[PDB]
């Protein structure tokens, strides 16, 4: 009936999601489990490992890490913007709203997606070719040692919900289309789309996890956690942007962070 239109939207978004993102939760788990046919990731547990590992990857250690982390985020933003464009109705909006939606959305989605890549112990990197340990990241000097830790904490809770790439494809769409971001010119059409996306997300959770109930409600509670986690992060960038003049922030990243929370 209507459940058809929503089933369609969910498949369109999954398709778009898979085209747009190189490393899915599917392969990432396979790699993390190790139950895969590919060569294991080069573990990075200390400065020695890091230096040996430098060859298998795309200035003091901590600041080097942060610049890689920077390079990668920018690629994330491109993958996310490409995806946003494939959300039915997204590109019909005011271009200034598109920018605002993304400006506020991207860090929420990075963290959602980082979590596909994380476990209690550490995080995959360079498209599953590295595995940088959580112990190693904590160990970095202030402020850098507290930079990734809030994201591991979030990840352990979020990964519990045992979501699928197909669930995430819609879940990230719903995030992008948040009609309650600072400075939108025309909220109604955004909210229109989000209601569709939220119905499709609800259907998808009933269908894909018919044994689990309230995954939908659990999942919407997490959407509020992120905004906080993202604020905590933007704050940290201010701290880093000030106490280090040795580093330069990437132009695209500046765009996002300037006049943001």
């Amino acid at each position: 009936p209507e459940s058809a239109d929503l089933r369609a939207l969910a498949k369109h978004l999954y398709d778009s999601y898979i085209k747009s993102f190189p490393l899915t939760k599917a392969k990432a788990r396979a790699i993390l489990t190790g139950k895969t046919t590919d060569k294991s990731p080069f573990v990075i547990y200390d400065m020695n490992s890091l230096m040996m590992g430098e060859d298998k990857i795309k200035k003091e250690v901590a600041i080097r890490i942060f610049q890689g982390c920077q390079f990668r985020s920018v690629e994330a933003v491109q993958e996310i913007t490409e995806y946003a464009k494939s959300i039915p109705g997204f590109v019909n909006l005011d271009l200034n709203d598109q920018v605002t939606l993304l400006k506020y959305g991207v860090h929420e989605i990075i963290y959602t997606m980082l979590a596909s890549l994380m476990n209690k112990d550490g995080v995959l990197i360079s498209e599953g070719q590295g595995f940088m340990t959580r112990e190693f990241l904590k160990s970095l000097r202030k402020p850098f040692g507290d930079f990734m830790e809030p994201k591991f904490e979030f990840a352990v809770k979020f990964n519990a919900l045992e979501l699928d790439d197909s669930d995430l494809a819609i879940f990230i769409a719903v995030i992008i289309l948040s009609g309650d971001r600072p400075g939108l010119l025309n909220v109604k059409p955004i909210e229109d789309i989000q209601d569709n996306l939220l119905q499709a997300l609800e259907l998808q959770l009933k269908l894909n996890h018919p044994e689990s109930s309230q995954l939908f409600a659990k999942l919407l509670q997490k959407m509020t956690d992120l905004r906080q986690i993202v604020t905590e992060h933007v704050q940290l960038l201010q701290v880093i942007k000030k106490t280090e003049t040795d580093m330069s922030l990437h132009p695209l990243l500046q765009e996002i962070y300037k006049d943001l929370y």
Binding site: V77, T81, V91, L95, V99, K103, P251, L252, E255
Partner: peptide, 10 residues
């Protein structure tokens, strides 16, 4: 938001 516009515009 120069680059964002560009990215979106593409």
């Amino acid at each position: 938001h120069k680059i964002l516009h560009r990215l979106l515009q593409e």
